[PDB]
Homo-oligomer: A and B are copies of this chain.
Amino acid sequence: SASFWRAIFAEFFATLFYVFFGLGASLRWAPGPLHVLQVALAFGLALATLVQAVGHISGAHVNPAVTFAFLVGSQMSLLRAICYVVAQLLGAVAGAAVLYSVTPPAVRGNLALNTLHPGVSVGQATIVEIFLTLQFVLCIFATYDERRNGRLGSVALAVGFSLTLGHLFGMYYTGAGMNPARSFAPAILTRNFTNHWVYWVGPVIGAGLGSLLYDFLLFP
């Protein structure tokens, strides 16, 4: 039916805004801003706003790893999962392209390219991105679990704060690229794929491990 493509657009538009507002706040307007907390809250609130906006439509995955987790969790058709990933990657590039146009080149920089910290190895970078996306996916699956008897608040505020947690930790390590689409968007628009498989392997394994940890070790 047509609720399929309304979700494909919801993924495309939300991922566009997610990258636009996320990467945009990750742009350094200062040589030293101490911007880790500021940037971490930006991604989290961007996710929280979008989940509140397009959660009922597409689930507001805006993340190939998150879509991969639901694909592993047997809650998404494969075709739709592919369609989300291509829409998220298309949305990510579109958001970063619009961000490129509206942002002066002096502060545009690398468009917040997820890059490994000098002393962080690709293996260490992979493990960190696995844990960054594992807890994040684990938080998503619990919040999106239909059986949620206990009465709590907003699932948007939860998964957003989980994303902020990952950035409060992982930004120093890998730039906190727990979103392959977010990492892809400046990689393509800057022509820089250095250690870019890390931001695909890491989140996908962490999404995969987080999915399996939830629906079999936590709630079969």
Contact = CB atoms under 8 A, between A and B. Distances in A.
B102 A104 contact: no
Interface string A93-134: 000001001111111111000000111100010011001001
A53 B102 contact: no
B53 A142 contact: yes
Interface of A: 6, 9-10, 13, 17, 20-21, 24-25, 27, 29-38, 41-42, 45-46, 48-50, 52-57, 98, 101-110, 117-120, 124, 127-128, 131, 134-135, 138-139, 142-143, 149-158, 160-162, 164-166, 168-169, 172-173, 213, 217-219
A51 B48 CA distance: 18
A169 B24 contact: yes
Given A45-B168, A119-B105, A135-B53, A31 B31 contact: no
Contact of A105 (B30, B31, B118): B118
